[PDB]
């Protein structure tokens, strides 16, 4: 089995206009996976911000795989006050079994400059 991804830091504070970077950490059992970045909407619904690999049928929300293979930067570029909210990552294995596993949720606070 593979463990649900971790998502850090649990609380990330930045000033409006700067970038905010979470790290999603995930070790898969095969080469077939999609890693998704979400923000919680009103009504407890996930809004997909970005994906690795990208959805080919589809820019402030970016995912970068780090060289150790298991760590991924998930970055809000030029964060806004209204980017404040709850974020998480979801890992989807596609082989040998389709499985969806969410991380614990983290908070982003974007402060007034």
């Amino acid at each position: 089995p593979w463990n649900p991804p971790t998502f850090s830091p649990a609380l990330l504070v930045v000033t409006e206009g700067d970038n905010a970077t979470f790290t999603c950490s995930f070790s898969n059992t095969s080469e077939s996976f999609v890693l998704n970045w979400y923000r919680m909407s009103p009504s407890n619904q996930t809004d997909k911000l970005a994906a690795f690999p990208e959805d080919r049928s589809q820019s402030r929300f970016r995912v970068t795989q780090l060289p150790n293979g298991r760590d991924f930067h998930m970055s809000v570029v030029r964060a806004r006050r209204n980017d404040s909210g709850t974020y998480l990552c979801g890992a989807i294995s596609l082989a040998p079994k389709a499985q969806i596993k969410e991380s614990l949720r983290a908070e982003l606070r974007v402060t007034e400059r």
Partner: antibody
Amino acid sequence: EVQLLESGGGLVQPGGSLRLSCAASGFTFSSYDMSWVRQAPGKGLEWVSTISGGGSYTYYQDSVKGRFTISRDNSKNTLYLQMNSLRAEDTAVYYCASPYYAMDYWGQGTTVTVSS
Amino acid sequence: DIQLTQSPSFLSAYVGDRVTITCKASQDVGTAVAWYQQKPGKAPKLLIYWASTLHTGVPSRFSGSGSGTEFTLTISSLQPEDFATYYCQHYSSYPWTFGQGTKLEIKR
């Protein structure tokens, strides 16, 4: 634009061999799974094989295990299906496809006919 | 390994009708189910995945529902371009399998 284009299908005798290829464009090829799906004359769709983005993981329909080999050349954006010991019931249109969760992109198919 | 059976194999309807196509799995496939449309001489096109997610660029009259072993494709009101064959597929584990196809034809 994502595009997939098959080649190589034709007539082969039972027990013979054939190599299909699929050329891909419009995406980072090595980041995505690739697959083959076939459709026998008048029948439905049947998944044949999947290969992982990096090529290390391969998966096969039971009826082609030990006869078909899927492979890819990530430097040339090309998918392959090596079909050995072909059988009459391997007669089909063969589609290249690319799974993301489901197969969101497909080629146009290439026709394979296995007959004496 | 896992079998998918669609019902019916052949369905006639009028333009404007609601159409319902079912797909039964021989064991639990969670929500790892997709639906495709295929017309003669053409490759399949993806309509729905994760059993209820409408794919981008697909008309809103297509919807999917279900989880576990029972899945449904609904066309809320049929249009002339919708007469075609529809396939369900699971990707829960290997081997991936398709249903046998449902051919949607013009009633008269």
